[PDB]
Amino acid sequence: EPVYPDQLRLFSLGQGVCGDKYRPVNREEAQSVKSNIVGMMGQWQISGLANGWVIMGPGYNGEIKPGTASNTWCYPTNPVTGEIPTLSALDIPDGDEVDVQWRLVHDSANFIKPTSYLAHYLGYAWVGGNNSQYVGEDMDVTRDGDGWVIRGNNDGGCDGYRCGDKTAIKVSNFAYNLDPDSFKHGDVTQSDRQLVKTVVGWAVNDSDTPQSGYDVTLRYDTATNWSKTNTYGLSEKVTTKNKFKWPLVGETELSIEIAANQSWASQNGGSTTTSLSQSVRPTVPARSKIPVKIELYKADISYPYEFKADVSYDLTLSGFLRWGGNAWYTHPDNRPNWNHTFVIGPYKDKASSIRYQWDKRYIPGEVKWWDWNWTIQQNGLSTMQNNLARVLRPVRAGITGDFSAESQFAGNIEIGAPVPLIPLDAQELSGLGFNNVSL
Amino acid sequence: EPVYPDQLRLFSLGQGVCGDKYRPVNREEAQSVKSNIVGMMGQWQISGLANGWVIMGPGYNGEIKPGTASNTWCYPTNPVTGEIPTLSALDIPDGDEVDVQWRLVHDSANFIKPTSYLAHYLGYAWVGGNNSQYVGEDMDVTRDGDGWVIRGNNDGGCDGYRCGDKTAIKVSNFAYNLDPDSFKHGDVTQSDRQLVKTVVGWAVNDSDTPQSGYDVTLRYDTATNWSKTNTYGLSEKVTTKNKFKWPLVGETELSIEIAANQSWASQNGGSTTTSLSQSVRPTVPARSKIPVKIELYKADISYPYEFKADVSYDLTLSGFLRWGGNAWYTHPDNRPNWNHTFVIGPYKDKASSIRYQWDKRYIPGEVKWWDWNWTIQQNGLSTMQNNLARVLRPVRAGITGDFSAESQFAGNIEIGAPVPLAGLRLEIPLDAQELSGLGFNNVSLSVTPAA
């Protein structure tokens, strides 16, 4: 009886009080899904469990201990069972688009068989070629437009009513979303940090009185030169949903942002300079001075990279629905020719989402496409779980190439031990890479 | 004025209703930290924002759209400001424990300088060596038992009152927690799922009535064995808080778990035998046969592995507190010699948590150790945020070796379409001896009515 974290719900209704149809999560259940519960809480949040127990936020190391809270972690009295497992991503090596698609679509155990069986369980007829007795075998896969069509070989003869009407499965509308968090890197070569300029001087306090509460601020322009190569052509189509700053490898600081909604192959380099402003607040005793210092650096890196691009696509099933046994919610018996498309990947809408339909299967008002409860009666809960798990298995494509950067930046305005009682040659700092160094 | 995600608080008090001292997040704020809010929500969770907007769970692709929710994402009417930023990990290459420790405590920009400056801002006197004017410089790094000491070089004479009393920073009590989710793997050395045998035959229905009330069930035992290596000796002290299952790689569905509170280096292999059974409830018409096929597979896999172990340690600062300028809440003026240990890593208690003391800084009853507000008035908010972010910056050590696994498993039971003959009868030969020598034991195909 494993709790599903995605069904946990937090309520703020007093000690051990839950929303209708919910009951409080106990200490044991909380422990089994500790990482998931804590990852839904604020830093110093403290939330209630069953029977005078409490779970603390990530700031408190997520400790489960006795105590009181006016808010409560809760779980459905009648949870939804048999969630679809999320298997691990199917990694596909980098290459040209047509080659990455090819790999995926001719994959019998990972693609053809699960998508054929999906169609078969829904009630689609004759999902298999004439050269075999089993579903998802003897399956022709054909390039067609921007997509691919999988369909039982229809050559020769066959037995069974309307066996010539083989169902087809079209996969189309491929999209590739680069996930920054998947960032790997090869052997790091060029990786050094060199101090170029170390500015010095004094901050003098003459007035007979200890001096403090004055900032010796600094401002200047940093710089970052970067580039990168794309080993293959898939990169021409991959984008990233959100703009992100290129990651920080080694000690060489970087100020690079990858723009979202823009080809990865169209973002191969850049150059930026930003007006920063280090700061410091001294406390120099009466009639004394202090040694101030500001260091300037020049660093650069070079390393082969790799991100993961999440592959998504539309799955379109067309063929006729079997007499006296199909999953369409009206359960038609006149063998209608049917078309449905599921979006395999990010959620677009209810009609095209297996996971939405699956998880709402026990809400009558919601069943307007497939009757997933019927697939379970017919084929067993675990059988459907496994099939859907494989149909919905995240596919990932590698995005490779070489990277190389360079940046100049200042350090902290450090101030040292005072002594009983600062020049900025712009032409010098200009030629060092630091322009507009107005301290 | 940025919204701080870890201050958001979900309330279930009705449409647009927040708890005392909180008010509804608005669409604008929620978009700016969208990924963070969505990652705190259940799959198909839907929660209200201000002014008729709603934010949706990761099931719904984290969409912000019009709607009405009885639960509301909320945010302090009076938020705690200037949070300590959270820098990206400092990553240390795998190695023996000493080397890893060495790389850390001899890292000037990333360790020596930030821990020195922290000692300095807290008010510890003489945090620097005699051969420099600046704090954190000319700093002697010395091995001291199981830990390390950082302290300004005191060679010779120096100018200043009690200048000979250099402040010491001692790092001790390291711990290395393996983060399951940091898993990454090299190019798969060996990989393949091999068909070793296919069981084929027929299931027959002899009666004159269509039959669909019986299960055809396969059951069998399969061994799964696995082993791993640990490149270095740091692993002999690495552990994970909670047990976890070994990441799935390739199609080789494996059932392996690393136990908690047990050294990584002590879990290098194992074998499990599981009794598995799968079934089908075929409908077969009067006087007909259905083909049946069960494919059996051998799966083996190999690859270099690498996790990250989050590195934690105690930071003990010892020296005297300066006159007319120290951070201790009482603000002693008699230069008392002070000793204080911070835990750098997972929280243990209020007293030793910079992150806790910082975020609570504006609550007068919570100020029982250091006065972080004073450090802000003396040095500026940004100066402190940047120093503290440096000292709390996540330190991760790589944990490596090789992984290799081996299993056997059956594919699903597959049935074809009914053929007329020229309560279900099976004609599917099974050789116990051959199957056993193939790794499949106690193998049986059964026909029985199910419930």
Numbering used by the authors:
A (entry chain A): 2 to 422, 445 to 462
B (entry chain B): 2 to 423, 440 to 468
Question: How did the manuscript describe this experimental structure?
Answer:
Residue His-132 is required for heptamer formation. Our MD-based observations thus suggest that the CTP remains bound to aerolysin upon proteolytic activation of the protoxin. This was confirmed using two independent experimental approaches. Not only was the observed structure very similar to that of wild-type (WT) proaerolysin (root mean square deviation RMSD of 0.74 Å for subunits A and 0.92 Å for subunits B in the dimer), it also contained the CTP, in an essentially identical conformation. Thus the binding of the CTP to Domain 4 inhibits oligomerization.
Aerolysin is produced by the human pathogen Aeromonas hydrophila as an inactive precursor called proaerolysin. Domain 4 has no known function but contains the CTP, which is folded as 2 anti-parallel β-strands connected by a short α-helix.
